[PDB]
Amino acid sequence: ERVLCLFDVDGTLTPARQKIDPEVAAFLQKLRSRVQIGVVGGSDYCKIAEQLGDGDEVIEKFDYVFAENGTVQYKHGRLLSKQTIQNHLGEELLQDLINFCLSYMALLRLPKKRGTFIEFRNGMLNISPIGRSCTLEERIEFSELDKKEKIREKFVEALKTEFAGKGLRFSIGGMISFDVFPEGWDKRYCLDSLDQDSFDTIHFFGNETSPGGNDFEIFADPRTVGHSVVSPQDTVQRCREIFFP
Amino acid sequence: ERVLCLFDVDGTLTPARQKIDPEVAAFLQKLRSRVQIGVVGGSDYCKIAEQLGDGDEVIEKFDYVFAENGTVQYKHGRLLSKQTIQNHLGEELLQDLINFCLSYMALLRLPKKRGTFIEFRNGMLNISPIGRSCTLEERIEFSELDKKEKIREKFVEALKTEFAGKGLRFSIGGMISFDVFPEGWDKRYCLDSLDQDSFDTIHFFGNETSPGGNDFEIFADPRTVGHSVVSPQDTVQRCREIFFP
């Protein structure tokens, strides 16, 4: 009777990192006549907003907007207070991590380096050996070397070992960087806030629900009814079979 | 007959990092009936724009806008192509510099660290041991420790020695960082483009014209008639005595 449909963004509602198909967007509003709707994605709010509407339309079109896995939350148009990664980790482990990354990267010799090797976000640290302020052409150059030399994979191996047992998780994505985040700060983070909003049912839809995928944990969590999808059209179809049969 | 008045921003036209007094702004437009007018400042365009008008009004109010010491140029409303620091320095010296900074900072133990330890700009690298993405409260905390421990001063000493003779310059400013930039990329940078615009006279006004100041080089350059000022009101007064006597 009080139902929430909660969607991953990339590959679930939109082409990855691209704008939503207006027909999919159209269905989501129709679905909204039967249930509340939310999104949860690993990217920051500005990226998610850009994919799902013009300006800040996303917070009006969706009942919930969980950016950076729910460390940033919009609830019915309202922004809620955010928790810092330093509050969760503590300053000492945070700096141990930062200094290990600085020390490791200083020894990496690349074709090019730029700036923003460590980006401090709400839900993670983003580590990029080339530097995030590089151009697209520079990204591609690094990506091709990285496939040959496994630069990011080896850095992640050394970090996991060094911080073994200290509650840090790692994910390599895109061309130039990897993510470092606390255990529990995958997509499941958003569920703790959702637990207090009196939903009879929360249906989660994602395209990475297999082990290793970024939807695995929230999909498998007992607080959600999980649904595996392979495309936005599959998502729309599943939602019809369930809510408009 | 073809005259340009070229002004530093901070302490010359406005309170440092603050909005221009509307009366000063008013005089500058009157001055514009007799001469062309330009600004040159070390900060990026967005900061300079914010101090001198609303939105992009600055490029309409001034004939020239030289941001980041002239590595970024607006000329009569038009943005000109910019040169990269890597093009000027070369990739090898640039990375030697970046890796020395990464290696040095990894050994610094601070109360707090965040992100963006190396910010890649158009006219410089900005190095911040705490990380530029810190809060104002965090900035002040670092600033007070830095006065006690001379963290930035000692880092600059080691860098100058290590890159002795290789054409790098350093400036420590504000609370959390220092600037690294190529020789010649002080305010004089903007003069090379100006040399081609057929001015009979270029009058430069600045509040840091003594040795060590960030206006010293452009003030002393033989391509300018230099003027030392101590406040925006002094600037307006000097411009009256010269152009409205």
Ligand SMILES: [Mg+2]
């Ligand atoms: Mg996905």
Ligand SMILES: [Mg+2]
């Ligand atoms: Mg589940």
Ligand SMILES: [Mg+2]
């Ligand atoms: Mg000044």
Ligand SMILES: [Mg+2]
């Ligand atoms: Mg001169």
